[PDB]
Structure 1
Amino acid sequence: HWGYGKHNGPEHWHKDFPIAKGERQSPVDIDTHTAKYDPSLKPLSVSYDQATSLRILNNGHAFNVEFDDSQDKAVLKGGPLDGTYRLIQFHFHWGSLDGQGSEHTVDKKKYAAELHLVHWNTKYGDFGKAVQQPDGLAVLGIFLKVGSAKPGLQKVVDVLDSIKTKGKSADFTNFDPRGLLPESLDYWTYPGSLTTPPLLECVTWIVLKEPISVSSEQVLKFRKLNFNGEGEPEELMVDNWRPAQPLKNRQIKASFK
């Protein structure tokens, strides 16, 4: 099925997922000069002190760190959001080289990687119901640049050897996602979509302006993962990013002057 190869990559996805050519697709280029400051936007409230991580899974496209979302433990509120959004998982997108890997771009700049913290709107009861609604999900996007190591990423990096291939999982309890945030919560926001099939138009995107720094060694270990299953020919899990999509009839708002 779909993937990131020449034969099944983003240019092909519209054949099985025609919303790929829809009116609110993600990611987008964030033109920093055209984004408007919206003084009515609230600070973001990221409340992760009671987060319960469970497991890490190689799903053949990325790796997901999954959370217990059966209670209001790790939630996102405020900013552009109405109501309470519960953390269900995070994952990354990254490149084969440090000059590419992010999904969103900033004045056409590509970062080495992008973190997505995925949350669903509790008014819809479960994630599967939320993805059917225009305000179902809130994804917090954070850029990664290569420089100093990110201490709070190292526990993720060190478990990757145990989930090398598609379908492998590992216990991943007691991980604190607060260690993946930058200092500032300044953000851009716009209405968009999932960046992988099914490409549902259910996401409020909140993209932080400040990148986090990770080391060359940390991102090298992302690049040792495999898209393939065990006992299949090795295809390195790299360049698992969708390129920027047309902005169409959308405005990107900034939380900051």
Structure 2
Amino acid sequence: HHWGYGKHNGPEHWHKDFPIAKGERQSPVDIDTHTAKYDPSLKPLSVSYDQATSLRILNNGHAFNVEFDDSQDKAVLKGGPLDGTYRLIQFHFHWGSLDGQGSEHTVDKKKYAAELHLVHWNTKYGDFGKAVQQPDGLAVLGIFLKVGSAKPGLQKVVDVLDSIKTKGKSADFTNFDPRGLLPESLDYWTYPGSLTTPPLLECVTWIVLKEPISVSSEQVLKFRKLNFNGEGEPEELMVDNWRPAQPLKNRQIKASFK
């Protein structure tokens, strides 16, 4: 498989190797704020990251993953629309070539500079590989980024990127606290969807926070210095690694807030 985000291997081609690309619950989507309905039955969302154990950072040629030890319930997501316990496995980002694009979800068609995905799996399925085969297998916590003030809790991430410039490179990345990437509010929209990259599995409950985090222009600039290619190949800057919004179809987006 040779999918990516260029003119020749990008989102509009993915459906050929991954036919679920055109399925019934694909992500990302546009969140119409005037159609999404406050759902008083959602419980409060619970983000328990106090015991999180980050291990490593990886450039996989599509994005970078900060990886976590998920061999126990150390960092978990519960509540909101979720039944049971979802364990944090990794986080990553999608971003643009300019500040006016980069996010995958959009809010009333507005694109943010980037989007953070904190990826969790449902413990009830025992491992991640099994969970991605289940309609309620994953829970991804989506956070928009906008350019403004710098986010201090992002800077360690920013600073390790020199060392994972190219595809395949990894660095040790211990004692990173993902709580520093959260906004103040946990108000959210939620809907059933998919992974936003191949294999585009329809296994995700999306929880997208309403309040974006601010990062600096200098911070986001350093994301754009990364490379899609591997070491000693011609340089393709890692930019615009985002899938555009997909048809909503027979789905409702529910809001946690009035």
TM bucket (normalised to shorter chain) is over 0.9
The CA RMSD measured in Å over matched residues stands at 0.2
SS of the equivalent of 2:90 reads: strand
Distance (Å, rounded) in 2 between the aligned partners of 1:19 and 1:233: 32
Q: Deviations over 1:85-144 (max 9, x none)?
A: 000000000000000000000000000000000000000000000000000000000000
Q: Deviations over 1:180-201 (max 9, x none)?
A: 0000000000000000000000
SS of the equivalent of 2:11 reads: coil
SS of the equivalent of 1:12 reads: helix
Distance (Å, rounded) in 2 between the aligned partners of 1:165 and 1:255: 39
How many residues are aligned here? Answer: 257
Distance (Å, rounded) in 2 between the aligned partners of 1:92 and 1:255: 24
* Structure 2 length-normalised TM: 1.00
Give the structure 1 partner of residue 33 of structure 2.
32
The answer for unaligned runs of 5 or more in structure 1 is: none
TM-superposed deviation, 1:160: 0.0
SS of the equivalent of 1:213 reads: strand
Give the structure 2 partner of residue 45 of structure 1.
46
Distance (Å, rounded) in 1 between the aligned partners of 2:179 and 2:97: 27
Q: Deviations over 1:5-40 (max 9, x none)?
A: 000000000000000000000000000000000011
* Structure 1 length-normalised TM: 1.00
Q: Deviations over 1:169-219 (max 9, x none)?
A: 000000000000000000000000000000000000000000000000000
Distance (Å, rounded) in 1 between the aligned partners of 2:71 and 2:86: 12
Q: How does 1:58-77 map to 2 (within 5 A)?
A: 58-77=59-78
Query: Following superposition, which runs of at least 4 residues in structure 1 exceed 3 angstroms of deviation?
Result: none
Distance (Å, rounded) in 2 between the aligned partners of 1:65 and 1:22: 29
SS of the equivalent of 2:12 reads: coil
Distance (Å, rounded) in 1 between the aligned partners of 2:27 and 2:217: 27
TM-superposed deviation, 1:43: 1.0
Percent identity reads 100
Distance (Å, rounded) in 1 between the aligned partners of 2:150 and 2:209: 19
